[PDB]
Amino acid sequence: MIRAVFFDSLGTLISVEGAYKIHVKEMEEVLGDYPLNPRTLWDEFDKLFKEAFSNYAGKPYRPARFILEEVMRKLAEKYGFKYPGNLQEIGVRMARRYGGLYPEVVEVLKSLKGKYHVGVILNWDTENATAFLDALGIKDLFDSITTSEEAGFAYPHPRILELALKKAGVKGEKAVYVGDNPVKDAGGSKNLGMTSILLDRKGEKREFWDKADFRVSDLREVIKIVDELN
């Protein structure tokens, strides 16, 4: 019955502890020798980039590289540090150095890939998203990489999922959907017939429990769930 498994957003693959490290080390490289706290610069930057990026939700996609540069450009002015080019390429380097994938990702992707179409969906730019997956070492494990830039709209928008399924050549009813935030993923409260799996690593997402077919704290359960559905 099931022919494709999709992972939406990097929260289903990267841990909060690993993500925060890459982010911390990201600002470290940006500041260099300039006397600024990387912890605080991340706080203001993450706050500002969220504001700017949220204004495009479900609307025609503007690449994040241009929204990041503007946010970073303003911070450089505010605090008086040089802007060392695009942050996107710095992130790929930090992911290379420190990683941050959940311990079982590569194992789970490897098993599913032998039986089903394993695709990933991201609310990011196509080029950088692929480079980031390569840095983590899981790019070649996916049968398809679908992004908001390719679909033309930011999260949420049906064209993203529609295109992901088009790549796999399967209908939604024959696909599984792994996400970590139902109100911040590609399909929003929409799936196209897909069987949803909510990743709650800590069991602290009660508000999202009732809007997901299955719940798991370990991605290896995605193997069993998909297996039983067949």
Residue numbers in the entry: 1 to 230
What does the paper say about this structure?
MBH reactions are valuable carbon-carbon bond forming transformations in organic synthesis, for which no natural enzymes are known. Previous work has afforded the MBHase BH32.1413 which promotes catalysis via a histidine nucleophile. In this work, His23 is replaced by Nδ-methylhistidine (MeHis) for the creation of a more efficient MBHase.
Following evaluation of >18,000 clones, a BHMeHis1.8 variant emerged containing 23 mutations. More detailed kinetic characterization of BHMeHis1.8 reveals a kcat of 4.5 ± 0.19 min−1, making it 13-fold more active than our previously engineered MBHase BH32.14 (0.35 ± 0.03 min−1) and 2000-fold more active than the original BH32 design (0.13 ± 0.01 h−1). Efforts to obtain structures complexed with either substrate(s) or product have thus far been unsuccessful. The MeHis nucleophile adopts a single conformation in the structures of BHMeHis1.8 and BHMeHis1.0, however a notable 120° rotation of the imidazole ring has occurred. In BHMeHis1.8, MeHis23 is positioned by an adjacent Trp42 residue installed during evolution. Molecular docking of (R)-3 into the apo-BHMeHis1.8 structure reveals a binding mode with the aromatic nitrobenzene ring sandwiched between Trp124 and Phe132 and the polar 1,3-hydroxyketone motif pointing towards a newly introduced Glu26. Instead, Glu26 has emerged, which mediates a rate-limiting proton transfer step to deliver an enzyme (BHMeHis1.8) that is more than an order of magnitude more active than our earlier MBHase.
